[PDB]
Each structure stands twice: as C-alpha cells, then as structure tokens.
C-alpha cells in the first residue's frame, strides 16, 4: 500500500568537450515516468509512461525548465566542489542527486529524502526529519553550515512534505491502472548438475511488479545460506522484474530442500519444490 | 512535479 515519487539526477563533467552530460529520471514506485538527457535532441522533459502523457503544455514546459535549472546548478557545484577538494580542472567528475517522498496506504506523507554525492560517495544529505543535515566529510561540512544559515532545508521540506506528495497522489489516480496493479511472480525450478553427484537447484521468479520479492532456500524446517547464491533483481524491459536463488545439493535428497517465494500480489505465499 | 528550488553546494 506504500507508494513513492523519486527523482534521480546525474551530471558528469566533460573537461574540454563542451558542457557536462546531464541525465535526469523520474519514478513513481518502480515505474519510470519521465526522463531528461542533455545529449538528446528535444532538450525537453520526456514521458516514459502513458498516464503522464495526459498532462498539458504548462506541466511539460514547466518540468523542462526546472530540470534544465537542475543542471545549471549542478554545473556550478561541479566547479565549487573542485575548489572544495582542491582538484585539477583537467579531471572529470560526477555529481549525483536524488530526492523524493513516500506515502502510505492512506496516501498521506510518510517520509522525505534529499541526498547528494560527489564522485559516487556521500557528500551531504537531508536527515530523517527534513530539518538538519548529515555531512560525510570535511568539504560537505562547509556546505552544511552554509545551508543551515541559508535556510535550505526549510524550502526543500515544503516540497518534500507538500508539493511532492500532492502530485504523487495526482499521479497515482491519473495512472490508476498502471501504478496500482499487482503482478505476481511466475515461478518454476531448474536442475543443473555440475559435479557429478551434487547438483545446483534454481528457483525462478519472473514477470512480477513491483520489484520487491524474497527468495529463500531451506533446512526443510526453515532456511539455508551455505550457498544460496542470489542475483540482483533485474528488469525485463516490459515493466516487470526477475530474480533467482540457487542451492547446490547432494544428489538424492533434492526432495527435502524447498524454495519460498514471498511477494505482494500473491494472496498466500508460495512454497515451491522439485518432486 | 520536480523541485522548484534547489541549493548550491
């Protein structure tokens, strides 16, 4: 019943080769729904989900402006941060920024975020209460104070507690059908020997949305992680996701190692095994 | 929406 809006920002500096490359993407839950790529031609914010296409010109003009302004800022920062860390103007660097808001089944504000990173490492970020800051190093320490005094939180928070959440609601219902669906995992199992007399056992989860899912292999009263090899949940490109968990097993007791598959959209949790 | 305000590190 939880939901979320989450914007993702990556600008990466191209010394000598023009401006920095700037990629921005928007998400509700685990659907992507808008994007911006500076190298792209249109130089506007773009839809990536049907229910947003609904939105009129001012929305799109608007979102185009703000996201451009996002990069101008990131661009300034890129220099500022060279300064802060004392860095050659000849190296390239990466600034990342993500923020957003979470709501509950009541669609009211739950949580807020706003975090920042230089060269893929924590810099500063907004703390849980949307009022103070956590700086990761000496440089961001500078920025903390300056922001505290500059009243940065006070604004970000009104967005995160308010306009962020207002809209996340607006989206959820205009995207009534895509966003609140609950596609459950199409599971099965496989056998691969390797060995000759042990054998790997592979529990598959497919076509499921959202991406939150648990795959465990077992005792036969309860669990196992000797070799429950598990791979990163991965996208299919149709909006759904995939995962698997695996155990290498002795060859004639395949028949007391089960696999459990918990997920939303499953009424009751699935237990699954190879007879 | 996406932020109307954004600070400078």
């Amino acid at each position, epitope marked *: 019943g939880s939901h979320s809006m989450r914007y993702f920002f990556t600008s990466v500096s191209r010394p000598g080769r023009g401006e920095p490359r700037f990629i921005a993407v928007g998400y509700v839950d685990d659907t992507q729904f808008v994007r911006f790529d500076s190298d792209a031609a249109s130089q506007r914010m773009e839809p990536r989900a049907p229910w947003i296409e609904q939105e009129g010109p001012e929305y799109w003009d608007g979102e185009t402006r703000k996201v451009k302004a996002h990069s101008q800022t990131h661009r300034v920062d890129l220099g500022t941060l060279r300064g802060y860390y004392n860095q050659s103007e000849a190296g390239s660097h990466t600034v990342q920024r993500m923020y957003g808001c979470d709501v509950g089944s009541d669609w009211r504000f739950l949580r807020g975020y706003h975090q920042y990173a230089y060269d893929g490492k924590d810099y500063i970020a907004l703390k849980e209460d949307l009022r103070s800051w956590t700086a990761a190093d000496m440089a961001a320490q*500078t920025t903390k104070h300056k922001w505290e005094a*500059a009243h940065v939180a006070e*604004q970000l928070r009104a967005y995160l507690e308010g306009t962020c959440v207002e809209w996340l609601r607006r989206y959820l219902e205009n995207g009534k059908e895509t966003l609140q669906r609950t596609d459950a995992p199409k599971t099965h199992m496989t056998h691969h020997a390797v060995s000759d007399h042990e054998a790997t056992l592979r529990c598959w989860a497919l076509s499921f949305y959202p991406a939150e899912i648990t795959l465990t292999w077992q005792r036969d009263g309860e669990d196992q992680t000797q070799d429950t090899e598990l791979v990163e949940t991965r996208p299919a490109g149709d909006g759904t996701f995939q995962k698997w968990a695996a155990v290498v097993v002795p060859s004639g007791q395949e028949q007391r190692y089960t696999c459990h598959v918990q997920h939303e959209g499953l009424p009751k949790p699935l237990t699954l095994r190879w007879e | 929406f996406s932020g109307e305000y954004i600070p400078t590190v």
Partner: T-cell receptor
Amino acid sequence: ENVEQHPSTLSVQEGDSAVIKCTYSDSASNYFPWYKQELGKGPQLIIDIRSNVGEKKDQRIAVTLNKTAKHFSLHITETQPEDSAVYFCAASRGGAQKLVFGQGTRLTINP
Amino acid sequence: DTAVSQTPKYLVTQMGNDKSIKCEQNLGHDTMYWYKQDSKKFLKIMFSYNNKELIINETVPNRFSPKSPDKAHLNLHINSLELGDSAVYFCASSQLAGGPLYNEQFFGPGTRLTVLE
C-alpha cells in the same frame, strides 16, 4: 518572465511612510531583493527575502512577501533626506538563475 | 579597499564602430555579470560567468561578445555599434555557493556609452 514596479515616481515628506509595491509573474520565484541606486551609480542591495518569512525588517526598511498572490513590497518607514534614490525590486528563482527587475521607482523625500 | 571596478567611465563614438569594455573584482567571487540599463532605467541581465563557464545568455545579437579569462576579470567587446546601445553597462559579481548563502550582487560604477550618427 515579468515584474511590475508601482509607482514610477513617489514623493514623501521627511516624516511620512513610503511604500513601493511590486508584482512578479512567475510563482516559482523564491528570492526577492530590493536594490538601491543612488545616482546613476552601481545598484546596491539594501534588503532581500528568501525562507518564506512574510516579513524581513532591518531598522528603517522592511519587506513583505505574500507569495500566493504574487506580490512583495518595500516599506520605508522613518523617511529621511538621504533615503532619496531610485529603488528597484527584483525577483529570481534563486541559485544560478536570472534576476528580473521592475521598472524601478524614483523616490523623493521632500525635506 | 575592495570592489567591482569597470573601465572606461564614459565613452562616446558613432555608428558601426568598435569599442570594448572591461571589468574586474577582487572580492573573490564565483560569478560575474553584465547588465544593460537602457534610456529609461530598466536593468536587463545579458550574460554571466561562473568560473570561466558561461551560464546566462539571454539573446545574443552576436555583435555582443563577452569574454571571461579568469574568475576575477570580465570583459565585453561590442562590434558594429547601434544608436540603441546608448545604454549604461553594468558589471556585477555575486557568490553562488552555500545556497547561495550570500545572495547579493555587487555592482560596478557602470560604463556609460552614448553612440551617435
């Protein structure tokens, strides 16, 4: 993309109050400074407003922000002969973005 | 002490000439700016430079050509002159960073320019 400064000129006695009212047309602006330009010289910041605070005051001058209605105002209480100048109000979206100026107001504090 | 300086003070030539204006600040700022203030005191931002990097551009009659060599200097060469360049051009400098924490823009004394037939 627009800011309306009213009035163009304004005369005040050495005692009275002077109020210049400005209207910006953007609504995502969140920074509103006032610039004092003495005599064809370089404009100078007297007072600006960020946070949300619907009133920022410093001694004899004060700013109001009523951002829903899209207007903000400079108040010169306590007028004096030195206060005579051309006053400019501006609005921006903060950060690396452009300030937008009004037509500016020509203030005479008659002594 | 410290300031945003700008030469020449005044300047006067005629149509289709070539003139250049300079400006400098030892305030230690990120950004520098150029504004045109026309006949009726209206200020309009033209260009800006954060660390040699150009941000604001507005519209470029590309006669109008900025140039920012280092953080502290900022010049404007104007080519093939206009009677409508009859304006006062204002260098300025701010400091972006920390918010910007300090928002004020510091103005130079302006370079007055009248161009004649």
